[PDB]
Amino acid sequence: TSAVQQKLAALEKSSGGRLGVALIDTADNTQVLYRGDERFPMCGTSKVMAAAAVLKQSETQKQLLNQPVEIKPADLVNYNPIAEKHVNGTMTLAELSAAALQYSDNTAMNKLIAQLGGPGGVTAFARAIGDETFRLDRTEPTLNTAIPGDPRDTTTPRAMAQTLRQLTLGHALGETQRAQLVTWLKGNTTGAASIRAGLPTSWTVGDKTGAGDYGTTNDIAVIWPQGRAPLVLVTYFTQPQQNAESRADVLASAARIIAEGL
Numbered sequence: 001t002s003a004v005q006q007k008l009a010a011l012e013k014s015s016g017g018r019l020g021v022a023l024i025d026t027a028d029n030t031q032v033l034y035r036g037d038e039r040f041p042m043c044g045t046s047k048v049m050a051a052a053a054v055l056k057q058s059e060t061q062k063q064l065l066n067q068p069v070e071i072k073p074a075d076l077v078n079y080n081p082i083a084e085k086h087v088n089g090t091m092t093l094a095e096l097s098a099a100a101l102q103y104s105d106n107t108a109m110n111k112l113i114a115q116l117g118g119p120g121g122v123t124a125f126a127r128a129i130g131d132e133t134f135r136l137d138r139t140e141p142t143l144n145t146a147i148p149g150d151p152r153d154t155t156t157p158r159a160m161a162q163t164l165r166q167l168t169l170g171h172a173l174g175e176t177q178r179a180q181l182v183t184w185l186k187g188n189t190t191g192a193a194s195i196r197a198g199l200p201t202s203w204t205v206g207d208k209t210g211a212g213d214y215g216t217t218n219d220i221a222v223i224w225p226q227g228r229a230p231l232v233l234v235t236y237f238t239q240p241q242q243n244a245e246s247r248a249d250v251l252a253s254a255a256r257i258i259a260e261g262l
């Protein structure tokens with residue numbers, strides 16, 4: 001183990017939970033992993049895969065993002081900050097993607113999942129871009145149950161870091177679609193206390209958070225440091241008590257550790 005991994009282990013010990021980290025440094029294509037091949041509940045970080053899958057569809061259906069989708073009262077779930085403003089109205093697939101990614105709207109995520117034919121359609125897209133680990137099994141809100149040991153709606157930090165790299169810096173998506181995803185991630189509103197809080201303020205960051213039961217608190221980010229090659233960082237955290245409070249500070253701390261030297 002390296003000093004980085006040792007610091008992450010110490011953070012984990014003090015936190016009382018289980019911490020998973022994967023950093024990809026595109027400068028030399030190296031990876032730093034902590035519990036990198038253990039499965040963790042994704043919660044809302046899975047919204048990146050769903051939005052990306054719809055972007056992929058739009059590469060051959062060029063008007064798809066503009067397609068209005070009906071929002072019915074019965075569609076609302078447990079957290080619908082944007083969709084609730086469109087009950088008995090519509091949101092386009094672009095608007096649903098922005099809401100799911102930038103506000104972590106759960107109704108918006110369910111519409112993306114439906115557009116893909118269900119959770120299996122999101123998983124199928126993951127497989128198509130070379131992610132053999134990701135699995136989406138449920139819709140919102142049950143995909144965030146985060147039960148210890150439950151393989152449903154999980155991935156590993158290594159796999160999610162590799163996929164996030166391919167989606168944003170690589171070419172799993174077409175050029176316009178890649179840029180659109182990056183724009184959405186950069187404009188996220190929910191990440192100020194997570195990875196962003198542990199990085200220098202001059203660094204540009206795009207991220208997607210997630211949260212669930214068992215105090216599950218997650219963040220995945222693409223990072224552009226000042227005058228250096230970009231990084232991808234996944235920080236997953238989950239706890240023993242079903243009713244544990246969120247711990248965004250732990251993600252900020254992991255980011256602070258990872259940033260040393262970069």
Ligand SMILES: CO/N=C(\C(=O)N[C@@H]1C(=O)N2C(C(=O)O)=C(COC(C)=O)CS[C@H]12)c1csc(N)n1
Pocket residue numbers: 043044045078079103104106141142144145190208209210211212213246
């Ligand atoms: C059964 O589902 N339980 C959830 C849940 O809906 N998580 C989802 C997820 O991931 N989300 C994020 C997210 O991206 O972190 C926030 C972010 O919240 C805010 C106010 O920005 C809004 S809720 C949504 C849950 C358990 S604890 C918590 N906050 N949510």
